[PDB]
Amino acid sequence: QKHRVAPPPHVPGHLIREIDAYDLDGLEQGFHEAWKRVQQPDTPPLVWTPFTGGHWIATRGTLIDEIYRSPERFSSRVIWVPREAGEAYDMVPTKLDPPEHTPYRKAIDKGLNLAEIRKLEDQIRTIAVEIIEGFADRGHCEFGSEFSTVFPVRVFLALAGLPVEDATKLGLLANEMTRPSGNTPEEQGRSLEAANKGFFEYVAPIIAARRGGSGTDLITRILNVEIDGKPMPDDRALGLVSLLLLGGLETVVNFLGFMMIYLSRHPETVAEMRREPLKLQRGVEELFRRFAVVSDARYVVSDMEFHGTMLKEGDLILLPTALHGLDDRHHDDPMTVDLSRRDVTHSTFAQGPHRCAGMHLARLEVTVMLQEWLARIPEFRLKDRAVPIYHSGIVAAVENIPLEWEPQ
Ligand code: HEM
Ligand SMILES: CC1(C)[C@H]2CC(=O)[C@]1(C)C[C@H]2O
Incomplete structure (x- = not known):
């Protein structure tokens, strides 16, 4: 039984749509397919659930892109639904608008910029190869539990200088951040609050140990960037390091599952990647267009009319990033991966000042993963009659991906 609120006076009945972002209608056929059901030919650009x-909910790519690019009109002071969870959320710098956001993003970029990420390629490759060699000769694996939940976590924990044994604890907190438990806005507010506190409890001793530290890990490097000529305050550092863990543990893991289910059903596309290695490299951004996983929100700063819609200060707008990359008004045949597509524009990493700081790392992990996978498992398919299981939320998830191949 679903919790419902009545529409406020400024929301007209013709814009109401019953959409549950935490349990989308049609989700059993796929997360991306379920969001695409919302985006019908005559659907208003903004609908209210x-x-x-x-x-x-913004239903078209142009609005999603514009909202992300417009922090003065759409604030990050709340970026989660329900509002209770968004008010409890404390990660840095995602809760900040410019100019407070700027010095913290500069600090993060010191650790995650493209030049720094390029240095990581070979350690990422050795992690990928080690995992893949564990099952490549077997002829089958459950891709979710044997690879997609293992490879990006091992990469990030090594990069962050954290013990691999912490993976389970951190994954459980991350699950409750992005798909918080509860049948009620207040309940979900409390679940996110508890997970956010768990992150702060975990990172606080690490921060204390690495301030002024000599380590070369990502946390030491970012933590010791000065903010306005001074050491980063404790409140900001807790949310900053927690956000790095959240991005490192619950983004690429889920992206890879969706991507691999598609490739397993499209052997002709896999074969193109095999025959043309540059098409793989140049085609990775088209994968990010096609397999968005984030759906988060912004806070309407002022009463306004926006795309013909009356909004009130404090209204929340959910931005399902899949509805930009998969918008048929932006991309012809949007559900098809076309490695040669010239226009790949998408909001999978959002837009504007908060555009994903981890995107260089995400791109490199996916590129290296495909290169090492195809080198050892060049052909593969989804097990006959297998049914992946899908979850929707602020970050989408998928599990049960049994793959099969003839060992080469
Ligand atoms: C498939 C992979 C990924 C996707 C789809 C993704 C998506 C996103 C999105 C949509 C945002 C904007 C959130 C908002 O402000 O509303 C974001 C921000 C961010 N991401 Fe990622 N991300 C990915 C990988 C990563 C990785 C691996 C990291 C490594 C730590 C990371 C770190 C961050 C950080 C620090 C921000 C905050 C940037 C800021 O507020 O200025 N992300 N990401
Ligand atoms: C929405 C995000 C995916 C984005 C900002 C968050 O809080 C995330 C959950 C991690 C980071 O990459």
């Missing part, structure tokens, strides 16, 4: 506390 009475679920998850009541909130708007």
Whole structure:
């Protein structure tokens, strides 16, 4: 039974749509397919749902892109639905608008910029190869539990200088951040609050140990960047390091599952990558267009009319990033991966000042993964009659991906 709120006076009945971002209609056929059901030919650009506390949903790529690019009109002071969870959320610098955001993003970029990420290629490759060689001769694996949940976590924990044994603890907190438990906005607010506290408890001793530290790990490097000519304050550092863990543990893991389910059903596309290695390298961004996983929100700063829609200060707008990359008004045949597509524009990493700081790392992990996978498992398929299981939320998830091949 679903919790419902009544529409506020400024929301007209013709814009109401019953959409549950934490359990989308049609989700059993796929996360991306379920969001695409919302984006019908005559669907208004902004629709309002009475679920998850009541909130708007942007249904077209142009609005999603514009909202992300417009922090003065759409603030990050709340970026989660329901509102109770968004108010409890404390990660840095995602809760900040410019100019407070700027010095912290500069600090993060010191650790995650493209030049720094390029240095990581070979250690990423050795992690990938080690895992793949564990099952490549077997002729089958469960891709989720044997690879996609293992490879990016091992990469990030090594990069962050953290013990691999912490993977389970951190994954459980991350699950409750992005798909918080509860049948009620207040309940989900409390679940996110508890997970966010778990992250802060975990990172606080690490921060204390690495301030002024001599380590070369990502945390030491970012933590010791000065903010306004001074050491980063404790409150900001806790949210900053927690956000790095959240991005490192619950983004690429889920992206890889969706990507691999598609490739397993499209052997002609896999064969193109095999025959043309540059098409793989140049085609990775088209994968990011096609397999968005994040759906988060912004806070309407002022009463306004936006794309013909009356919004009130404090209204929340959910931005399902899949509805940019998969918008048929932006991309012809949007559900098809076309490695040669010239225009790959998407909001999978969002836009504007908060555009994903980890995107260089994400791109490199995916590129190295495909290169090492195809070198050892060049052909593969989804097990006959297998049914992946899908979850929707602020970050989408998929599990049960049994793959099969003839060992080479
Ligand atoms: C498939 C992979 C990934 C996707 C789809 C993704 C998506 C996103 C999105 C949509 C945002 C903007 C959130 C908002 O402000 O509303 C973001 C921000 C961010 N991401 Fe990623 N991300 C990915 C990988 C990573 C990785 C591996 C890291 C490594 C730590 C990371 C770190 C960050 C950080 C620090 C920010 C905050 C940037 C800021 O506020 O200025 N992300 N990401
Ligand atoms: C929405 C995000 C994916 C993005 C900002 C968050 O809080 C994330 C959950 C991690 C980071 O990459």
